[PDB]
Design a protein around this ligand. Structure first.
Ligand SMILES: [Zn+2]
Lengths: 105, 49, 151, 312
């Protein structure tokens, strides 16, 4: 699917999930054993960084809008990374538009 | 792609399509703001159908 | 302060807190189903806090609800897994031995042999996988001319 | 996971549980629960030794129910090591299952045919079997007994006379027990399964451990023409709600655009007038509203980490 896949967070392997049902959409990374859990509210993300397709690394960082908070995820298969990046692009763009509409109004 | 909407058109969409109003009245103040709602509506298959 | 002890404020007692609170086959069957990996849960720590577990674990092996890895010295349960499949014993040994005697052909020659008997082969022979001027005039426009060769 | 993938998985599960021992179920179920799973991780998940995982992996490899993938890995702070991964290549496993199912039934059917034929003969001493035709050229001068050639001893009738019914019983049992495989293969033939690769399998990976030493990644070497045997397989939408004040603003912008377009086409000045004589070219109501509002109010009352990156 396009909402889950294996990911590495802080050198810990786990499953990254994109929760769209609960507003605002939040990204949850859960360690394999469940000892570690991380959650980021996508309303806070400003830009979405991603390593180029011409590099052996498969990282994907979500910089937080304001020492701004930064969340970096490393993937295993690029297809999973692309399918996760594509869904994130929609959420970040939409929330950026919402902020633009709110500030303008 | 940028699409422009107006209050008159918003009312017209509700009048000609009661389902859109049904999905509008129950969600605008509860979960997400109107700009997000209409952004979702056009992307949905409902707007295509 | 320790984590292996549970406090009871109703009476003010300290009770032991087992790793997996399992004292019934139903609890074990759901705990094994809830595992997010295929890491089996040891019977050594399952047996702790549960008076009898070999009696219960063996009963589920016969019913094919769980998978058991047993010791070689004497048959004794170790790490167990949930049996996501069907019956654990469904074929007589007269056919297991026959299945062991059949030797598959050379891989690249298998699809052809299956295609001669009339069975559709879900593979192909890998051999078929086809792995797929001079002197310029004006140069004062050094870095301006973009190559619009096609339209 | 596609619905056919479940059918293939169930077929593999049934075959392993019915035609292989206990530990085989553990090994294959582990790499069916997970995608490609490193050998070290596989050992850690089942808590079995190398000398015990060996026979299991070897047999599941000979039958092509499991595929192997070796690649060089370069940990940033350790000696480069070659890691081994195990996954399932569904087109390969299904062909092996189909061939083995056919062969087992064929062998039993042939044994039924052979067992229904005349018995034959054997020599008790030299343990050499003689067929009905071969025994008829050895009988003594008295036409009473069949004599052996090496031993010159009477022959003894062979067995398999009574098994005429048992072999049919065996076939009757097998087809009943092997029924799920036949039913699953029928559904598989209808659909088309895609061949799996180490990289493709990595897309469905469920990590086994928090800090596995094996890097579950496939970074193929650059411009490597080397080919190994059996290593190849066959927008944004933005919306804007326009208010009345925005509508008039948009109209003003449209008017400005039209004005600019008109200028782009208008003729210059020198072409407009004949330039002969000119020199040559060269180097208060608010209070009224309130008293009304109060008056009407009275009325109504009365009435009631630095790496290269891009931007996506
Ligand atoms: Zn003889």
């Amino acid at each position: 699917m396009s909402h889950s896949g294996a990911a590495i967070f802080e050198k810990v392997s786990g499953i990254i999930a994109i929760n769209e049902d609960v507003s605002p959409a939040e990204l949850t990374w859960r360690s394999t054993d469940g000892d570690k859990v991380h959650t980021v509210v996508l309303s806070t993300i400003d830009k979405l960084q991603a390593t180029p397709a011409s590099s052996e690394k498969m990282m994907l960082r979500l910089i937080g809008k304001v020492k701004p908070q930064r969340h970096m995820f490393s993937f295993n298969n690029r297809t999973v990374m692309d399918n996760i990046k594509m869904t994130l692009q929609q959420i970040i763009s939409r929330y950026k538009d919402a902020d633009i509409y709110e500030e303008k109004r | 792609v940028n699409v422009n909407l107006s209050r008159e058109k918003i009312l017209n969409i509700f009048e000609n399509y009661p389902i859109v109003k049904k999905a509008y009245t129950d969600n605008v103040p509860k979960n997400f703001k109107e700009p997000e709602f209409w952004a979702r509506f056009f992307s949905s298959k409902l707007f295509r159908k | 302060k320790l984590d292996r002890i549970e406090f009871d404020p109703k009476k003010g007692t300290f009770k032991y807190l087992s790793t997996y609170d399992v004292h019934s086959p139903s609890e074990l069957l759901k705990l094994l189903r809830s595992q997010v990996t295929f890491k089996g849960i040891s019977c050594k720590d399952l047996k702790d806090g549960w008076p009898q577990c070999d009696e219960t674990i063996n009963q589920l092996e016969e019913d094919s609800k769980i998978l058991v890895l047993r010791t070689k010295k004497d048959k004794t349960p170790r790490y167990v897994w949930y049996n996501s499949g069907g019956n654990l014993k469904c074929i007589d040994e007269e056919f297991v031995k026959m299945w062991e005697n059949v030797q598959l052909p050379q891989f690249a020659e298998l699809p052809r042999k299956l295609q001669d008997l009339g069975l559709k082969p879900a593979s192909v022979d890998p051999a078929t996988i086809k792995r797929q001027k001079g002197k310029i005039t004006n140069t004062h426009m050094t870095g301006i001319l973009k190559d619009y060769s096609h339209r | 996971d596609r619905p056919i993938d479940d059918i293939v998985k169930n077929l593999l599960k049934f075959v392993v549980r019915g035609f292989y021992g206990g530990s085989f179920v553990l090994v294959l179920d582990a790499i069916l629960f997970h995608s490609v799973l490193a050998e070290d991780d596989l050992k850690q998940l089942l808590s079995i030794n190398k000398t015990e995982l060996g026979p299991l992996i070897a047999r599941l490899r000979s039958d092509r129910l499991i595929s192997i993938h070796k690649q060089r890995e370069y940990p940033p702070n350790s000696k480069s090591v070659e890691r081994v991964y195990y996954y399932v290549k569904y087109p390969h496993a299904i062909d092996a299952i189909k061939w083995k199912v056919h062969q087992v039934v064929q062998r039993l059917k042939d044994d039924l045919d052979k067992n229904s034929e005349p018995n034959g003969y054997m020599c008790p001493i030299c343990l050499t079997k003689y067929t009905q035709l071969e025994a008829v050229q050895l009988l003594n001068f008295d036409r009473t007994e069949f004599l052996c050639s090496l031993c010159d001893e009477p022959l003894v009738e062979d067995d398999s006379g009574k098994k005429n019914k048992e072999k049919q019983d065996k076939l009757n049992r097998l087809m009943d027990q092997i029924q799920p495989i036949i039913d699953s293969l029928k559904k598989i033939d209808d659909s088309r399964i895609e061949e799996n690769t180490f990289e493709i399998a990595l897309a469905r990976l469920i990590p086994p451990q928090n800090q596995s030493h094996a890097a579950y990644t496939y970074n193929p070497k650059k411009g490597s023409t080397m080919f190994r045997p059996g290593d190849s397989a066959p927008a944004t939408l933005h919306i804007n709600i326009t208010t009345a004040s925005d509508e008039v603003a948009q109209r003003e912008l449209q008017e400005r655009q039209a004005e600019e377009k008109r200028k782009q086409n208008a003729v210059p000045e020198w072409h407009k007038q004949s330039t002969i004589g000119k020199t040559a070219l060269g180097r208060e109501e608010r209070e009224n509203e309130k008293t009304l509002n109060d008056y009407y109010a009275a009325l109504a009352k009365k009435q009631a980490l630095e790496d290269e990156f891009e931007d996506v």
